[PDB]
């Protein structure tokens, strides 16, 4: 309910995408006393995102990759079509990557955005009153909290955009199993899974040989509809 950004509300082509969404609480005591210090805020957030986005993106894709590859290969083992698999993998990977990205970056973003502001504020004002430094620390903590969702979203979307093509590359061999089989006039079916499903799995929940039924794809559609951190999609 509390998500305030949709996936398209934020342009991640450059750090300029962050600028229109920065929120500056006017009641902040450091801002009442020094209204000019509001200028320092934009660069502080851009710097924080700039320094964290690539390692967060790399780490999130790496974690999600293995999990998504294993589960998708498992679910689609009796599916000779590549298309259903590729789409489902696309949606699952983008979703779990977005989730890992959110978990990975939010606390570091808080620490980084605060630090950058405390430094900017201390730099702009060479004076260091014990009361003013309390205002500076307070302002920096507040601003960080108020802008973390925006920054996080920027990094998540960066991660999601890169995740898709990485998943395609990972599933190359799976796409090649099915391509190679079709050009031999046969449908691909994982022999181990084929045997297991036929012998061990109760009919009601058994994987079907060939395509998967549309109703069963519901979980994969939800990955597409509902991405963590974003408003869901609408029609010694």
């Amino acid at each position: 309910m509390l998500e305030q950004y949709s996936y398209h509300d934020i342009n991640v082509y450059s750090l300029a995408g962050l600028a229109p969404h920065i929120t500056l609480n006017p009641t902040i005591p450091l801002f009442q006393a020094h209204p000019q210090l509001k200028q320092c805020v934009r660069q502080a957030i851009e710097r924080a995102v700039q320094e964290l986005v690539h390692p967060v993106v790399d780490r999130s894709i790496k974690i999600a990759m293995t999990t998504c590859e294993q589960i998708v290969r498992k679910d689609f083992a009796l599916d000779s079509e590549e298309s259903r698999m590729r789409i489902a993998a696309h949606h699952m990977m983008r979703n779990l990557t977005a989730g890992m990205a959110m978990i990975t970056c939010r606390e570091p973003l808080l620490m980084s955005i605060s630090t950058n502001l405390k430094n900017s504020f201390a730099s702009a004002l060479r004076t260091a009153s014990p009361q003013q430094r309390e205002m500076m620390d307070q302002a920096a903590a507040q601003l960080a909290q108020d802008n973390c969702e925006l920054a996080c979203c920027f990094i998540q979307k960066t991660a999601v955009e890169k995740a898709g093509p990485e998943m395609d590359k990972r599933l190359a061999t799976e796409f090649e199993l099915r391509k190679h089989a079709r050009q031999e006039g046969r449908r691909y079916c994982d022999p181990v899974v084929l045997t297991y499903q036929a012998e061990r799995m109760p009919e009601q929940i058994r994987l079907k040989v060939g395509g998967v039924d549309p109703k069963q794809l519901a979980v994969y559609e939800e990955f597409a509809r509902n991405v963590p951190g974003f408003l869901p999609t609408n029609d010694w």
């Binding site: 509390l2 979703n95 989730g99 959110m102 799995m201 069963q216």
Partner: protein
């Protein structure tokens, strides 16, 4: 009783759709003790593990800032409960690990909020890891050592509830019992020291607030640590006094196993 099995199949099918999933989660988690082959049916059916992962990830926005409600927690913990069965089963354990599913639980282990919804979240997530190491498989320990599980457990051993402290200390114990685990934890003074410092704090706590099950695991951890020569040297010089005097004499008289372990520990430190 055939009607029973068909209810189970139906609930499993009803996990894929978010419309029917919550109720299916509830019902399945209740019957996981009466259905021996529940785990492979969950693993090998279409989309099922994907749905359980979905339940986990969709909780992530409620972690930070910490806003998790009792309702949200109860629901994901039903999903977590099903993953515990999958983690425990000899037919699904290896595949569960290969899919790195535990990694999507670690964000929960990292939370520090002390509200009931979060404590239950952490405890249920620990329970999945607990189920993994109870199988005594080397592949499990090697996987855990590749991950940040140990500092996650140590934080919980320090600040968690009695229950969470117990499961986390048990996980640590299983890791230590493994030869690779012991060598890893004793590889550097910093690693060993951090572990020893937490156990020491726990021992102090235990002298004020008794817990037989937690003390047992703490003692076993120390005992295993003394198998390592460098750890043995360090423990000669920094073992908690409460483990050497009669502080725990009363609570231990009923606990013959822990008693023998403590006596074995003291004996090791002399040599």
């Amino acid at each position: 009783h055939m009607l029973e099995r068909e209810k189970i199949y139906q609930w499993i099918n009803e996990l894929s759709s978010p419309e029917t999933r919550e109720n299916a989660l509830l019902e399945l988690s209740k019957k996981r003790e009466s259905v021996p082959d529940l785990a492979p049916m969950l693993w090998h059916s279409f989309g099922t593990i994907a749905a359980l992962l979905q339940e986990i990830v969709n909780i992530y926005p409620s972690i930070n800032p910490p806003t998790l409600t009792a309702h949200q927690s109860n629901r994901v913990c039903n999903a977590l409960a099903l993953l515990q069965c999958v983690a425990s089963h000899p037919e699904t354990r290896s595949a569960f690990l290969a899919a790195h599913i535990p990694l999507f639980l670690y964000p929960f282990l990292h939370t520090v909020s002390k509200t009931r919804p979060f404590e239950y979240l952490r405890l249920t997530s620990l329970g999945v890891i607990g189920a993994l190491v109870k199988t005594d498989e080397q592949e499990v320990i090697n996987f855990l050592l590749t991950t940040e599980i140990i500092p996650l457990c140590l934080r919980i051993m320090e600040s968690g509830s009695e229950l969470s402290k117990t499961v986390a200390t048990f996980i640590l114990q299983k890791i230590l019992l493994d030869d690779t685990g012991l060598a890893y934890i004793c590889q550097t003074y910093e690693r060993f020291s951090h572990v020893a410092m937490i156990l020491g704090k726990m021992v102090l706590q235990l002298s004020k607030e008794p817990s037989a099950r937690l003390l047992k695991h703490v003692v076993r951890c120390y005992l295993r640590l003394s198998d390592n020569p460098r750890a043995r040297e360090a423990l000669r010089q920094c073992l908690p006094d409460q483990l050497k005097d009669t502080t725990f004499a009363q609570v231990l008289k009923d606990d013959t196993t822990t008693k023998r372990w403590l006596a074995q520990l003291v004996k090791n430190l002399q040599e």
